[PDB]
Structure to design on (814 residues):
């Protein structure tokens, strides 16, 4: 019983770790850069007026 | 790819800040699950 | 002093918007108060905005409408605005302009002062040396207010910050009673409250509540409904501050001024700027908003050689709950400390919804101490904060880790969370808790665990307080 | 058929009068010859551009994005020339079109056009990228008068609920596609595969017509029901059981 649980829990940990890693090294920088660009554009538009 | 496709605006600033907050909460929640899973792994291999 | 007869003009070279331009005025000066009389007999006040040779411009307070060219009198005063300050103003109620509205008499002025005030010498500043009690357990215990500290209260549209303000008003005071009540009877404390940019329901609610609490004998009240002229919005604070100054440094009292809805102040100032044709600044707000809020906030503290103090608790609302909006940004920069209210906590039907996790303070270390309070304060605050943070993040953990894998100590942390939000924070509108009651409840909440988990408390105080 | 061509090499300023002549003729044909007429105006973006140019020439105090502040008033004067009249028989049915700068819905021109007129059709670009024609996204398309223009006798007793339900299924299907993009099939279940299949067959059978495909309304409701049959009758909530007891089983 112990060994069965171990063998399945290994791949469970692997998929969870892959998900958290992909989340922390793909989407967050992308959103942050988009927000930087948005702030810049808003500033431009106000200054023209 | 490097920029989510949307027209810049103030409303857009609100939605993107909200989406960033959602991603952060998801990351923290996943970290907690990973903590529990590695605890189970260690306790299984304990003895 | 002044003995010359006043002038009056029947010259109107034009009108535009909220302004009225005339000319042929003899030796005009800036910031001179001007009266007006219309064809129909109405009387309106005003101020001088522009002056250039014999040309003059006057921004009419009450709003321009139906001002003829040839049939219009315009009397001049020759003096800047001056307030009739007086100690006896306590127990009264006024409007923005200072005209009484409670069926009472005109103030028998005791002295005249400049509305603008004067800067206070940094040499004669005195650091704060003692705390106060506002009546809120959540605020006093977790976040001390010294004498002379400037702590704002960030809120947003749709929250019950006004109820919190009223609660603070009807319960603010001192805790000198540590040693004896006999020496405590010497009370010299008063409150001045400046409701501005307030709708009608809230104005009536304030008046009724202040009258109900029975302590109106030491409360001055200023009202400026949103109907009244927009310029009176940016004159109410100056009157309130001048009164607070005169009471603090000429009567040696301990005054607590509470300002409401500084966002409306900002909006009124914006409108004045735009009417004055000046170039816009950042976000449409004028550039010198920083200097203006500085000259409003900086009138407080303590003065060497005078037994008195002024404490400021401004309130304001954050548009769109945006913490980087300019008004809260500048307000945070100028002032010391900050207190939050959080939407979620109000949405948990918890009153007062005070979110202590992002609430800070700047003078807590020196406001409290042996003598002026118990010796068991700072460690208790640190322990409560640490326990609560552990409990909240631990609830976040159990949300996915499952409640079955939790230790028993984990259940103790959850128990601490629920009891802390059930009793310490929730007080009810009239439960007047003191500081000592607050610390009693804090120790009772800490009793759940053993002293071993309480790793922020020194063992010396553990041997005394923990086994109670 | 009557025409008013204004090529791109023509003088720019005469754009501000071109639609007005057409609408004047339309009013005449509506209320003096008692004939039912359909108006079509094209490339209103150029119309807005001409207004911008004439305004910037006069050095007037400007508005958002450089456009004059009074755009809404002028567009109101141009669009409200439509409707029917007591004691008359003719009518005006106006169908303008316009182009979207950079596909931004919040651009001032389309904003004001949505505000004055009665909704949108929204030829969508992404559907066109998948060779779909007419590439129209039904989800943002709005038509206020449709609610009372349907019913027993007018079109049929069985029109509204089909429409509302199909709209709801499309919205939920796009939600499922978004959630799949977030995670994938591992946390989903059978119903999500069904909704995605519904989306596929709905973009296959409902939207796509062809350059000459002339459909009839009753046949259109037949196709709507054939699409609705992919799910059970129980999962549907918008449609009352009353219509299902008469038209679901087959």
């Amino acid at each position: 019983s112990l060994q069965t649980s171990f063998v399945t829990l290994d791949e469970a940990i692997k998929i969870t770790n892959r998900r958290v890693n992909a989340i922390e090294h793909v989407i967050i920088p992308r959103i942050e850069r988009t927000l930087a660009y948005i702030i810049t554009e808003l500033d431009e538009r106000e200054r023209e007026e | 790819k490097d920029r989510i496709e949307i027209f810049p605006s103030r409303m857009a600033q609100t939605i993107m800040k909200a989406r960033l907050k959602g991603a952060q909460t998801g990351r923290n929640l996943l970290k907690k699950k990973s903590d529990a899973l590695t605890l189970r792994f260690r306790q299984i291999l304990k003895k | 002093y002044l003995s010359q007869p006043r002038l009056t003009y029947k010259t109107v070279s034009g009108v535009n918007g909220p302004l009225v331009i005339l000319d042929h005025v003899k030796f005009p000066r800036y910031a001179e108060i001007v009266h007006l009389t219309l064809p129909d007999g109405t009387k309106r006040s005003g101020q001088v905005l522009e002056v250039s040779g014999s040309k003059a411009v006057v921004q009419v307070f009450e709003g321009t409408s139906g001002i003829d060219a040839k049939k219009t009198s315009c009397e001049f005063t020759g003096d800047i605005l001056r307030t009739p300050v007086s100690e006896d103003m306590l127990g009264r109620v006024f409007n923005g302009s200072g005209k009484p509205i409670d069926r009472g008499p005109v103030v028998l002025a005791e002295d005249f002062l400049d509305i603008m005030g004067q800067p206070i010498n940094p040499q004669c500043r005195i650091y704060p040396e003692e705390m106060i009690q506002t009546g809120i357990s959540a605020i006093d215990g977790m976040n001390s207010i010294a004498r002379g500290q400037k702590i704002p209260i960030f809120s947003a549209a749709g929250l019950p910050h006004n109820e919190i303000a009223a609660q603070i008003c009807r319960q603010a005071g001192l805790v000198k009673k540590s040693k004896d009540v006999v020496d405590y009877s010497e009370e010299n404390f008063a409150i001045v409250f400046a409701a501005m940019g307030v709708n009608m329901e809230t104005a009536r609610f304030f008046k009724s509540d202040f009258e109900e609490n029975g302590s109106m004998d030491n409360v001055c009240l200023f009202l400026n409904l949103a109907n009244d002229p927009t310029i009176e919005r940016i004159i109410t604070p100056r009157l309130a501050l001048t009164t607070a100054e005169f009471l603090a440094y000429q009567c040696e009292k301990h005054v607590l001024v509470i300002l409401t809805d500084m966002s409306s102040y900002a909006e009124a100032l914006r409108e004045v700027s735009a009417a004055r044709e000046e170039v816009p600044g950042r976000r449409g707000f004028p550039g010198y908003m920083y200097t203006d809020l500085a000259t409003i906030y900086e009138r407080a503290g303590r003065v060497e050689g005078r037994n008195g103090s002024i404490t400021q608790i401004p309130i304001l609302t954050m548009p769109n709950d945006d913490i980087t909006h300019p008004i809260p940004d500048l307000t945070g920069y100028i002032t010391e400390g900050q207190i939050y209210v959080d939407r979620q906590l109000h949405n948990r039907q918890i009153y007062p919804p005070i979110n202590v996790l992002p609430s800070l303070s700047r003078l807590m270390k020196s406001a409290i101490g042996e003598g002026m309070t118990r010796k068991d304060h700072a460690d208790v605050s640190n322990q409560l904060y640490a326990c609560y943070a552990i409990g909240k993040d631990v609830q976040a953990m159990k949300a996915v880790v499952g409640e079955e894998a939790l230790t028993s100590d984990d259940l103790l942390y959850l128990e601490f969370l629920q009891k802390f939000e059930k009793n310490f924070i929730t007080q009810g509108p009239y439960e007047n808790r003191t500081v000592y009651e607050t610390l009693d409840i804090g120790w009772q909440l800490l009793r759940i665990f053993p002293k071993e988990m309480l790793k922020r408390i020194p063992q010396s105080t553990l041997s005394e307080f923990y086994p109670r």
In short: Chain C touches chain B at residues 320, 396-397, 399-402, 405 (CB under 8 Å).
